[PDB]
């Protein structure tokens, strides 16, 4: 029930199963791909909170994989070591065959916690985590993957956050400058303007002057 | 380790302006990276805050007060004082001079803030309002 | 033809895949995994990026389906099942 | 007075209790919230900082946190010595930089 | 033709099997694997359900030896296997 | 070597491999099938002692399975928890991949020890083991599973146990009412019948008196 | 044709593999693993044994590197994707 | 891109890729096959010290596996328990699926220690380590296995040695007559001669007499 | 709790019927879901049971006795009794009453048994039998 | 005395020892198999019920089993107060009901 | 004196402390390498022998090993009767069976 | 418990053969699986080997003394002896006889060795060499 594109002298076809096409050759099987593509390449907002939102969990559903052998760069991948509120995984390990997203521009981890009742974190749109070269229904932990979808065809940094209520529908996050230096996370700062405001804080030395960590609001303007 | 200690007349008379000066010592409030405030508690209340000043300049001030009250500073002296005009018996409170957390304060290009809260406070000194 | 109907779209695709002789097709000497890529840069001629992302927005309903009624955790075979149909159709 | 706190809390030594909070998102829901810790007879001491944070001298019973427009305080085991006016603030954005605390909670040991 | 010639036949079939849109077909708002069952019943018209009985019975022992000499702890490859050997026999 | 079964304008046909046949047609994989059958189907007795017999213990062996894409409800699926008599495992937990069978009206669960020489317990017919969608030459511990057959071709409740001399020739089992309360199992009682002997004790109260469980006899009339 | 152009190459084969009925063929009953081998020798008769091993040695470096490139840990395709592309290059 | 061979009237010929050959026939998969051979067969030398030097570890390369219907038997096959100089061990213990090499003459067992940088030790001239059916890129820890490499077509005693630098260049190894009793191992010694000095030395009784082990050097003559 | 005690004549003479009486208190033995018994043991010897009673009026019996044992009860009283006609020299023993464990009996449809077996034993008594 | 038990058994204090029983398909391969301690001058008391149970005052040294025909009762660690007269019973299905003990098993402490 | 041997080491007590060896393929890289320990006024005692086998007699703290033309002997933990003249030998099979010792180092403890 | 035991006559005259006897007791090093050796140490130097026996009539030699050293046993008497001739005042040394540990020696059919080596010292007989 799977559909299939080919390419043809014209556009990219929708391969039909009910009509023979007799002018579609395939001569080897090294005609075929399977290649992974970003839900970012469709306009999907990218940053954390409005990221996380679209992920949640279920249990009684098993994960599945399948596998890719070419695809997009990310712009924006994100890895997650997220626990329970009581100090406990949400998330298994990622299990052996899997490796992280192959190439991107900026990571995303989020070191946190919050409510996470099922066995798993499933993509609410159904888009799915990608891996190196795996697809999956479900979020592993500690692994870099993508968020995306998988067309079948015949033919670097890391950002650091904390956060809070992750499995919550009113949650918070923080960008991470230093261990005791933080700023508050907000939508209208991309990974770029998140690591000036890293370069201005870094740079003056107004850093916490106390024990604990302190919290910069960034005003609006 | 900087105190910050109050002073003024004890009693204050309606509609004058009161005027309470805090000393500091151990550090210096007025020209170093700090805000400080004053804030006071009326007997049998809670804390209402007065107003702040940041050693450059800059000031906030309750609501209540925008049109009443006046806070500034002599560096030269390391004092700091607090002004508010028209004073009435509903102003009667312990008064306190107090320090924002130094160092603990985020200026930037514009689209930035603080990270700044309170720690220090002085003694208190209690101003009556009467005839 | 596959039309990729929603509101964004990237008209470019920067690539990367696992598509000389040596030492280095020995394993001991051979790079490690993240270097066994290579990559490049393709523009959306005749329309073919987008419709790509449209194909994948189909597919993924259908192969969650699909997925959801099998056995297999690791499923690397619908490539060779559809190579299997395509003869089949015509051969059968 | 604009947070609003319970006028009173309380339990007997040893007893988990808590203080809660309640603003808006101009302050709570702003910016972060700090506590402070009045003994009778003296000024408020900075008990907690930055919503979890313990200033030093401030013993690991004292926790607490900070949820959309409200926020708590928490003693993890009441002791007598936490008979205390407590006290929650955070600047308030809507008055330009307002500093802002809550009613105060009269926490009584039983 | 196959033929159960044993002292007992069930002769009916109750039916279990894995073989509309919406939000369903993403696993986070779809049914747990408990119900992506579906059922019938069939009744053994020409002698069908009691011959596939005996086809199960002489595959168990083709089936047993074929999994003793091979190195698949999990293999799904059978059907695949008889599909190339169909086309290959009359195109090989 | 395996043979197949072919759905004829007749009857089910034997699939040759010598004879090419020229009117079997096959325009797709969907025409493909594996369905799982129980033995119950062909008669095979379902009590508990006479379905144990058939299992027995084995090493040297490695477990194989393959899978189904439908099959046949069980009347009766069972589930074992057998200890060697030592306290110690006779059979490793069921390993990922495997949930039990789908449909079945009476499982049989035992909970009880015997002899488990073995590594794992195989079916002494060579039936396969039927978990949820795969066949298995093993019995996996704490998972339900129906006894029986493969065929390819082209196109609820649980009822306690409890068992001494799981592994020996001489065994026993019992029908568990309460924790305190068992009968004697009997080959004539089948599951509604067993259940009918719950209800009675149940309903009289005439259960154990005393700290220790007692085991009735069910008089033969 | 296939040329084992090294100094050394033995002129035999001493196999072993995996390649009746009765309980033997229930795993309750039949042996272990080590004994469902069979064997036999084999003389280097026209020059095949030799160019088997060069077919190997030529094997080995393709392989690696295809290996290399895939997300399969454990695979058994080889063989049935060229059963597929005999076919294609004929019928596609 | 891999090659394949093929039975022809004349000899084995390469199968091309390129060239259709319409004489080639293959009427089923029952013609094809994977064929373990071993690297002795083309005189590569077998004597310990002259073959662990083969091998050697690497990180960051994951292990891959492919198998074998039949193969050759092999008269020197080898099994590792080879720890860091820590205590710890080199190499995982094998994983399941795997199993020994399944006929051999001699197995060349050796217990010590050396360097082991890596996560696996791989072949460095690419060969495959010979498990029972399964070809592997990497040495998996205490299973027999075969050196070889592997072609596609269509148509018993234990040695065991003790070892110190194995991950080293200057590296020694003792061949094993008794608990306390070794004698240095040296290349000119087949695994039938190194029997004869076992014969010679258990039979004269001539044995440590304290309570180490001691080493006997064997006369060049 | 409940006490089954053995009274009789001690003394009984070859041939005639001994009769022997348990009273029972604490509890009914004779009215409430129990079994009870006799059960003798010889000097030197190990347990025979005599008979089996249950309240209703159920009774099994020792083979050897069942044309000469006889069980019987007075809920009334709460007292039971055994007689034995014909007693012989071989009958010397120590007599006892016994209980089997109550609330311990399944009593069903027809296809259903007991669960029960003995607890309580009574003191014993010694019966000879002698010219 | 129908069933078959042993004239005698022994051991040494803290040894573990064992008394059996052998009878038919009619009691012991019919219904469970109680046992009964009868110390030296006094009435036998309920040792193990329904095969393995203990009766409340018996202590974790006594164990028993049931197999076939064959049962078993088992002390692990004799005490000296464990000298006494052992029983097996149960009843008897070919003679409607009748209840078996044993012959009686001397157990000796040494 | 043909392997080369330090003239002295030392360390304090407890110190882990060891003592090199050096020669040639004709006798370290022949054959293996023994040490011996003289305490000053006395003969010196087999201390390791066939590289690291210990004498009954010989502490747990000697160790030893070989690699090469080279050898080493060590010890976990200095104690003050381990002051002394420590030598390394083995058979010289260039000479057709030597027995060659090493210069022998004087151990200090400090 | 093997004892080698020194003697000779401490002053030995330059030039002369020095001839220094071991007497053995506890076990034969003379007669069993056992070599044994000559070694001697010049006051303030190390270990220097003179030679070694086998008792079957095998001998090694240090280099230097190849030309000058004899060694010998008599298994009669289970003593050995060290001869060197042209003795200098360079030979002054403590000598000592030695034992290579027995049962140690494995002698074959050629193309084998030993995995013997040293343990029980004499006492050291001083000798002096001098006029
Ligand atoms: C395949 O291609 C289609 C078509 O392009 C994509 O369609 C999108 O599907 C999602 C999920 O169903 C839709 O999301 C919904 O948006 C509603 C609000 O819409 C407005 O606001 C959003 C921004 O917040 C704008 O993007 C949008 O244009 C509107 O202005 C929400 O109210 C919905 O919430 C409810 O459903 C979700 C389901 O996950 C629940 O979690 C919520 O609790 C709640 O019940 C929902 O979020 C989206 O609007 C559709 N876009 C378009 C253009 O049609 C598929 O997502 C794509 N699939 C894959 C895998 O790539
Ligand atoms: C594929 O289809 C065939 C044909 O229908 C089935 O054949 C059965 O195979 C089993 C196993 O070989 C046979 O079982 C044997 O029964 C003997 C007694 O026979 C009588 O009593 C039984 C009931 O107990 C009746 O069902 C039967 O009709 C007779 O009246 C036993 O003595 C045998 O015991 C010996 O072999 C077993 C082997 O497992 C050992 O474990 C024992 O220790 C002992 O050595 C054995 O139990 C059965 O009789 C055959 N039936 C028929 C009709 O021929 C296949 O079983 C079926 N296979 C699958 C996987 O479905
Ligand atoms: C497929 O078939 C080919 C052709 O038969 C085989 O080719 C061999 O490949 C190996 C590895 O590259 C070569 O080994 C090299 O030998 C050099 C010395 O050569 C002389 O001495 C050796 C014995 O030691 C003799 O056998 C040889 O004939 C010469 O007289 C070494 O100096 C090399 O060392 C360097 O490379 C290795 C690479 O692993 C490093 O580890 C070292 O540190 C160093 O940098 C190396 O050992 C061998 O000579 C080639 N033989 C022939 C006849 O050409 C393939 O091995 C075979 N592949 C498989 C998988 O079967
Ligand atoms: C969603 O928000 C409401 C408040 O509007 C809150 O009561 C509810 O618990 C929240 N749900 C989750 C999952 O956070
Ligand atoms: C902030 O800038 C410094 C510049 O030296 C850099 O080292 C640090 O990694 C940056 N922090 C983040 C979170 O990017
Ligand atoms: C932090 O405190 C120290 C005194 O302990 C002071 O010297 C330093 O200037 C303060 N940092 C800032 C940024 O003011
Ligand atoms: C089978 O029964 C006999 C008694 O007839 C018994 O001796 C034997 O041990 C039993 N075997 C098993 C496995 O229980
Ligand atoms: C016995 O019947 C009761 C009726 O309430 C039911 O709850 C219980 O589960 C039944 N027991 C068994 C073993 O079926
Ligand atoms: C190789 O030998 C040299 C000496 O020639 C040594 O320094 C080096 O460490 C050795 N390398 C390894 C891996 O043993
Ligand atoms: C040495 O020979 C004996 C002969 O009895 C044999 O038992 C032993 O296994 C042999 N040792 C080795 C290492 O082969
Ligand atoms: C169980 O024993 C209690 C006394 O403890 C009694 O009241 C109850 O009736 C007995 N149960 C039965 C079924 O006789
Ligand atoms: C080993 O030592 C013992 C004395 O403890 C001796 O009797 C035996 O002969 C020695 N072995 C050899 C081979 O000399």
Redesign the interface.
Do not use: M
């Given at each position: 029930?799977?559909?299939?594109?080919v390419?043809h002298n014209?556009?990219?076809?929708?391969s039909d199963?009910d009509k023979?096409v007799?002018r579609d050759?395939?001569?080897?099987?090294?005609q075929?791909?399977?290649?992974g593509?970003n839900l970012?390449?469709?306009?999907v907002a990218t940053d954390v909170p409005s990221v996380t939102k679209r992920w949640?969990f279920?249990?009684?559903?098993?994960?599945?994989?399948?596998?890719?052998?070419?695809?997009?760069?990310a712009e924006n991948c994100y890895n997650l070591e997220i626990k329970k509120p009581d100090g406990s995984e949400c998330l298994p390990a990622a299990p052996?065959?899997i490796?992280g997203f192959?190439?991107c521009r900026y990571v995303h981890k989020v070191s946190g916690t919050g409510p996470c009742a099922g066995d798993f974190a499933?993509?609410?749109?159904?888009?799915?985590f990608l891996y190196?070269?795996?697809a999956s229904?479900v979020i592993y932990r500690g692994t870099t993957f993508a968020e995306?979808?998988?067309?079948?065809?015949?033919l670097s940094t890391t950002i650091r956050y904390q956060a809070?209520?992750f499995g919550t529908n009113?949650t918070?996050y923080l960008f991470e400058v230093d261990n005791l230096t933080y700023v508050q996370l907000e939508s209208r700062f991309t990974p770029q303007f998140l690591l000036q405001?890293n370069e201005?804080?870094y740079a003056?030395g107004?850093r916490?002057?106390?024990?604990?960590?302190?919290?910069?609001?960034?005003?609006?303007? | 380790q900087v105190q910050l200690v109050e002073s003024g007349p004890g009693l204050v008379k309606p509609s004058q302006t009161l005027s309470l000066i805090c000393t500091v010592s151990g550090g210096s409030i007025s020209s170093g990276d700090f805000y400080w405030s004053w804030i006071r508690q009326p007997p049998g209340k809670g804390l209402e805050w007065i107003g702040f000043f940041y050693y450059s300049g800059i000031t906030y001030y309750n609501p209540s007060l925008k049109s009443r009250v006046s806070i500034s500073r002599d560096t030269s002296t390391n004092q700091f004082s607090l002004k508010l005009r028209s004073v009435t018996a509903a102003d009667t409170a312990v008064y306190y001079c107090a320090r924002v957390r130094g160092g603990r304060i985020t200026l930037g290009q514009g689209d930035m803030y603080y990270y700044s809260g309170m720690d220090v406070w002085g003694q208190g000194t209690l101003v009556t309002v009467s005839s | 033809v596959i039309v990729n109907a929603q509101p964004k779209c990237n008209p470019n695709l920067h690539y990367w895949t696992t598509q000389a002789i040596g030492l280095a097709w020995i394993p001991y000497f051979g790079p490690a995994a993240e270097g066994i890529y290579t990559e490049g840069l393709m523009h959306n001629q005749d329309g073919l990026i987008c419709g790509l992302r449209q194909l994948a927005n189909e597919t993924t309903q259908a192969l969650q389906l699909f997925l959801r009624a099998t056995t297999e955790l690791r499923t690397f075979s619908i490539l060779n099942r559809k190579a299997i149909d395509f003869l089949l159709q015509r051969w059968g | 007075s604009v947070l609003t706190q319970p006028p009173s809390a309380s339990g007997t030594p040893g007893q988990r209790v808590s203080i809660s909070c309640s603003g808006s998102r101009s302050n709570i829901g702003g910016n972060t919230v700090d506590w402070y810790q009045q003994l009778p007879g003296t000024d408020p001491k900075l008990l907690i900082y930055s919503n979890d944070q313990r200033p030093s001298g401030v013993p690991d019973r004292f926790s607490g946190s900070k949820s959309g427009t409200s926020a708590s305080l928490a003693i993890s085991g009441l002791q007598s010595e936490d008979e205390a006016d407590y006290y929650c603030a955070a600047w308030d954005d809507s008055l330009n930089g307002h500093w802002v605390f809550g009613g105060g909670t009269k926490l009584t040991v039983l």
């Open positions: 029930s799977i559909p299939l594109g390419i014209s556009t990219l076809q929708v199963v023979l007799c050759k395939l001569s080897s099987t090294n075929l791909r399977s290649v593509l970012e390449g469709n306009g949640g279920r249990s009684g559903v098993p994960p599945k994989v399948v596998n890719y052998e070419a695809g997009e760069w052996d065959g490796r192959p190439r499933f993509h609410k749109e159904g888009a799915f190196d070269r795996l229904t995306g979808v998988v067309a079948f065809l015949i809070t209520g009113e918070e405001l201005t804080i003056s107004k916490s002057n106390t024990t604990g960590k302190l919290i910069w609001k960034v005003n609006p303007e | - | - | -």
